[PDB]
From Swiss-Prot, chain A:
Periplasmic topological domain residue ranges: 1-318
Subunit composition and interactions: Homohexamer. Part of the tripartite efflux system MacAB-TolC, which is composed of an inner membrane transporter, MacB, a periplasmic membrane fusion protein, MacA, and an outer membrane component, TolC. The complex forms a large protein conduit and can translocate molecules across both the inner and outer membranes. MacA interacts with MacB and TolC, and this interaction changes its conformation.
GO cellular component: efflux pump complex; extrinsic component of membrane; MacAB-TolC complex; membrane; plasma membrane
Keyword field: Antibiotic resistance, Cell inner membrane, Cell membrane, Coiled coil, Membrane, Transmembrane, Transmembrane helix, Transport
Family according to the record: Belongs to the membrane fusion protein (MFP) (TC 8.A.1) family.
Protein name: Macrolide export protein MacA
Induction: Expressed at very low levels under standard laboratory conditions.
Chain's gene name: macA
From Swiss-Prot, chain B:
Periplasmic side: 1-265
Protein name: Macrolide export protein MacA
Induction info: Expressed at very low levels under standard laboratory conditions.
Membrane topology: Single-pass membrane protein
GO cellular component terms attached to this protein's record: efflux pump complex; extrinsic component of membrane; MacAB-TolC complex; membrane; plasma membrane
Keyword Nucleus applies: no
Keywords, comma-separated and alphabetical: Antibiotic resistance, Cell inner membrane, Cell membrane, Coiled coil, Membrane, Transmembrane, Transmembrane helix, Transport
Cellular compartment(s): Cell inner membrane
Physiological role: Part of the tripartite efflux system MacAB-TolC. MacA stimulates the ATPase activity of MacB by promoting the closed ATP-bound state of MacB, increases the capacity of MacB to bind macrolides such as erythromycin, and provides a physical link between MacB and TolC. When overexpressed, the system confers resistance against macrolides composed of 14- and 15-membered lactones but no or weak resistance against 16-membered ones. In addition, MacA binds tightly rough-core lipopolysaccharide (R-LPS), suggesting that the system could also transport R-LPS or a similar glycolipid.
Amino acid sequence: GKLDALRKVDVGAQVSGQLKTLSVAIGDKVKKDQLLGVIDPEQAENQIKEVEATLMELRAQRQQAEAELKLARVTYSRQQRLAQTQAVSQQDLDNAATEMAVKQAQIGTIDAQIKRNQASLDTAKTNLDYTRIVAPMAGEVTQITTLQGQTVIAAQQAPNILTLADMSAMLVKAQVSEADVIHLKPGQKAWFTVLGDQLTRYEGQIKDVLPTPEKVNDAIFYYARFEVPNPNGLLRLDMTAQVHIQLTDVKNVLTIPLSALGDPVGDNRYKVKLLRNGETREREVTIGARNDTDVEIVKGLEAGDEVVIGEAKPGAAQ
Amino acid sequence: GKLDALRKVDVGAQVSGQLKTLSVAIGDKVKKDQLLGVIDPEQAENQIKEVEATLMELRAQRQQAEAELKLARVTYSRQQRLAQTQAVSQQDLDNAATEMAVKQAQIGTIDAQIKRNQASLDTAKTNLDYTRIVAPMAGEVTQITTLQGQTVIAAQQAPNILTLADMSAMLVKAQVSEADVIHLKPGQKAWFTVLGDQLTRYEGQIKDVLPTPEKVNDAIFYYARFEVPNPNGLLRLDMTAQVHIQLTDVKNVLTIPLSALGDPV
């Protein structure tokens, strides 16, 4: 069994630029959305000042139309007030009511520009946020691939500045062989131990099985995972771990000691037993399940029959 | 015999951006067009608001020409109503009717702009849909190459976010040797069994033979496929499977065991 963190992340950054600083050394805890490294932000500040200058430009250009609208409006009312006395035709009234509509449209046409550029301002600011890396999730820093002061560019692979892992629950990769994967029903109880502490058993429920195998040349293997609690700060990553995965909990069922059983043919299993008569007799027994010390016998021998652990002899009374 | 899913599809994304979330867990079932991961969509929303602001701009600029068209039209009819009594020659009638054609063309010239920009709006929105990955087909999530929170860039090769596979039925890769490939007529009946269950026969029709061989150093090998049903969720991917393909059964005829044969010449 291989060992790893419950969750792990390879943090990166979208933008190119020199890495001016990296505030955190490895081994320090970091809370979510904490500041990390800081890529150079001079350029983004430049486009921001540029866009703000554009908004100022429209801020004045609107101020022009604001005055022309006053001119057209006062001209219109000043025409109508004389126009109740039938001023210089309805012609000029149509020359006044329409121009005011034009100046009215102009200010809105400018407001749309202020709208699109303020909308662009978010596009300007959003690039600036990319320069300042923040942690997606809590967990002490593991490894720093990108050392401080290195130039970096991101037009291809996402750069690997650093990595993170949540060391509070150590998932295990128990690579059970393909020969036994057919069993291994979920929720079966299992335990494991590490080579370095010899005898300090850990245990828990099996969680699930990974659909995708990865071979080591010969023999396919399939993983399985637990969820062991990790206090004390022990259990380093990728530590070797011997794993005992509960195969089954059969009960109220007999098992035959290995020393006594006979195995005719290659499937048959003679087993001499003492009888109530006191005369021993063998019985063929069906056994598939087996342990290091015993073979499980669900069927083949009546309970309480004595069995000849040594020098077994069919038809031979003790 | 190697074993694999009836269909398997890797999934990518067309756009760069931090992966804010990946709601699916591995082994979960997913129906077609279900939402999966979500790359950050702030940018696409920005271009969307920008384009909508442009449509607002033309929305007013058209309103201007709408007024000028009223002016030119009222001026024209008010010229013609006098013109039945011979107003100021046909000269001003030509100075009026032509202007109305201009104001007429102007609004259409603007409507074409509203058309091209509404057409551009689909170009804006379509990028936003790329940010939200959806599953091409039903299946369970076999693997997640890309863990949550990783930065990803699609300026080059399509990233492998997560693979999918359909396990409703299992296909087998039965690699028959090149020496025997000349036989093996399609539809010949065959069966197989896994090493891990010892004795539990599966069986079915052979489907076909793959045209393109792949080799393991020495000796070429050609594949063949079945289509075994998969009840109860058994048979993990890439499980080893011993495979018996059927040659002919001529009968009513003796066959000598090879153990004691004598073969002079």
